[PDB]
């Protein structure tokens, strides 16, 4: 019906920095080839749409955000052999080309074909399917979810169970996905072990549920929201620390109360300084601590080398490490079978239309991930 | 004959920073409970004994340092029970006490009875052997090595082949055993990679050493003095390069020579610039790179954390990650059988009493390793 045709449709634009989204009316071409267009079923809010909006993390605007959502396929281009219209799909945010070294490599995950490192805002052939007041619009790292359709290339898309319930498994497609995949792809948790998870979001509490499955024996939630605190142990935080309840710095609270170090430590929130907090509280000689949250553009840190030289290791890794389009249909597979929960991380569901109110909610500490329904 | 007696030798003491080590009459004091005195028959010049000079490394003045050597047990304090007068020893500057959480740990070797991390220049009951004219003078890492006899503790020293050649076997106390396990133990180099070595002094030519024994395909070894090529391509590099020689950042060389980045990065000099650099050039997703050498006391590095959440893996060790006493007798067995080489390393042998020689033959740049005999 709309197959072949440009699609007018509304979208949340973010024309400027530090401005709420516009949701106004975008047009959405048509698919060429080994393109999908997608018409949104769900999408949730992750703190890195907001640090679009915040300047935090760059990319050219105007632009259409969302990167963690869910949909079903309306139309495909010309040699397009993976979906089919009528298909569920989540887009991915770092595709899978299968064809580089990266893909070809048995750990890595992030694809030369991502559009996160040097970012264009484009389709992989470098030109926009989104115009908005006549005006071309940026995509968002090949997906762009905070519109009623989008057009995504072939790499950037994977097919999900037909029975899947998209208002939820929309998490794997960011959140759920990363946490998981931090504690037991990226770091490999072990049996028995003690880990720290700094930031207790939707993505703090997906690094939990993960350092559960892989049967750590003590997590240690750390956010200075103490209303996050419950959440997290019904998820498998075993205790729960607030860095403002205490007067030495928290590496040193952490330090003691794991008898001398973590094994695993965890920066789900994106600031420089926990960033180096995070890696001293991991044991010296074998500690392990990765790095998820998103640091301010451009901006170094600083840190002293004597704590990697006794033998920590610090990593960090995008979507927790998964290769995205073998690993997203196994992940619904495994949700559908009960494996894992995505209730918890999900405090709140709106209409898209209230798109602001569901930045606010998580910008004023309410929310772990509120779900935009299309 | 002197057991039990306090033994009147010559020993190497550093009074003060930045000034020739000065050839004394000590007296060292007789074995306590639990403590080996030891006779040195070799004993290396490794840069970090030079970085005690310098003032890089910060260790409580006046010191006898050495810490890479090999010697024959004197005599032993009451309740020793792993080695015996005559046998063949070589003392470990990173102890293995075996109940500590780490010793314990199957990955983690920095004991925490080390003398490293706060260091206190002192036998592990917190005094001294040596005395030079009534005055104390403290120990370098519980090992001592520059003075024809030495006391350390019994969780730093460890029992070799007695058949083993002292003059070269010393080298398996640091060099050798650093840059080799940084390869093959910490890194764990894979077969067919790509690996970058920054610094060809000792340790970096036996991190070369150890890319090859894993069957690495290329090794690339970075030095700002040429004359130190010939001697890596010797041991295994396929390629070596010289930043000074190039009008851009040698990372970029490395990542294009390496068509997009190395498997394997080494850090076997102690600058924080080629800290970074050396991260850099490792691939940005499945990228490897290990710390090796020792910087300036007190100094941070500045890094974007950008470069670990593409997924690099950044780590470092002390000894190659080996567990000291459990690893030496077993890579001294292995030199025994022709396993590895260690002639490469030595260019030069003096007597003790020309340690200041071998000192500036290290600082010129024209040795690798300088052994002393007693
Ligand atoms: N690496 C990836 O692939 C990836 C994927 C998703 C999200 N991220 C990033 O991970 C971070 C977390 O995402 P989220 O959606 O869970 O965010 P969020 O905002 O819901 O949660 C962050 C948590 O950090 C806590 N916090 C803030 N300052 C703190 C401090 N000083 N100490 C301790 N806790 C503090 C907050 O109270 C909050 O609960 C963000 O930076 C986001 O950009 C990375
Ligand atoms: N981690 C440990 O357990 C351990 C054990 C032994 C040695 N170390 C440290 O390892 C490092 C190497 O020791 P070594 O005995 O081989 O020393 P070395 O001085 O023989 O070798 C260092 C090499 O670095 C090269 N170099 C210096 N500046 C450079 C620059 N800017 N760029 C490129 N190359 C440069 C020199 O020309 C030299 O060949 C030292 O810092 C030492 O303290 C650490
Ligand atoms: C600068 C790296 C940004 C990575 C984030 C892109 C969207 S997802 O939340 C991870
Ligand atoms: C402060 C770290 C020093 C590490 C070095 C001590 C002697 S060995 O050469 C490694
Ligand atoms: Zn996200
Ligand atoms: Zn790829
Ligand atoms: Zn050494
Ligand atoms: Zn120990």
Same mark, same amino acid.
Request: a positive charge.
């Given at each position: ?32 080839? +080994? ?15 907001? +640090? ?86 940026? +995509? ?235």
């Amino acid at each position: 019906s709309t197959a072949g045709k440009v699609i007018k449709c509304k979208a949340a634009v973010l024309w400027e920095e530090k401005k709420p989204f516009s949701i106004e009316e975008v047009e959405v071409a048509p698919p060429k080839a +080994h393109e999908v267009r997608i018409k949104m079923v769900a999408t949730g809010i992750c703190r890195s749409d907001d +640090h679009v909006v915040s300047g935090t993390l760059v990319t050219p605007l105007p632009v259409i955000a969302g990167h963690e959502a869910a949909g079903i396929v309306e139309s495909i281009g010309e040699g397009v052999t993976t979906v089919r219209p009528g298909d569920k799909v989540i887009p991915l945010f770092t595709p899978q080309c299968g064809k580089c070294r990266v893909c070809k490599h048995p750990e890595g995950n992030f694809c030369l074909k991502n559009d996160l490192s040097m970012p264009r805002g484009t389709m992989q052939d470098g030109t926009s399917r989104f115009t908005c007041r006549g005006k071309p619009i940026h +995509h968002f790292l090949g997906t762009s979810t905070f519109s009623q359709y989008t057009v995504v290339d072939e790499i950037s898309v994977a097919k999900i169970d037909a029975a899947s319930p998209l208002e939820k498994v929309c998490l794997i497609g960011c959140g759920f996905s990363t946490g998981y995949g931090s504690a037991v792809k990226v770091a490999k948790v072990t049996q028995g072990s003690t880990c720290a998870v700094f930031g207790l979001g939707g993505v703090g509490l997906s690094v939990i549920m993960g350092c559960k499955a892989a049967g750590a024996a003590r997590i240690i939630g750390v956010d200075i929201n103490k209303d996050k605190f419950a959440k997290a142990k019904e998820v498998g935080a075993t205790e729960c620390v607030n860095p403002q309840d205490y007067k030495k710095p928290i590496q040193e609270v952490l330090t003691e109360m794991s008898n001398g170090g973590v094994d695993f430590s965890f920066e789900v929130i994106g600031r420089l300084d926990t960033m180096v907090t995070a890696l001293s509280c991991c044991q010296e000689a074998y500690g392990v601590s990765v790095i998820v949250g998103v640091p301010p553009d451009s901006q170094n840190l600083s840190m002293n080398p004597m704590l990697l030289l006794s033998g920590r290791t610090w990593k960090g890794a995008i979507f927790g490490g998964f290769k995205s389009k073998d690993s997203v249909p196994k992940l619904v597979a495994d949700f559908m079978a009960k494996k894992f929960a995505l209730d918890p991380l999900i405090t709140h569901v709106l209409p898209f239309e209230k798109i602001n109110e569901g930045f606010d909610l998580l910008r004023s500490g309410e929310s772990i991930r509120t779900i935009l329904t299309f």
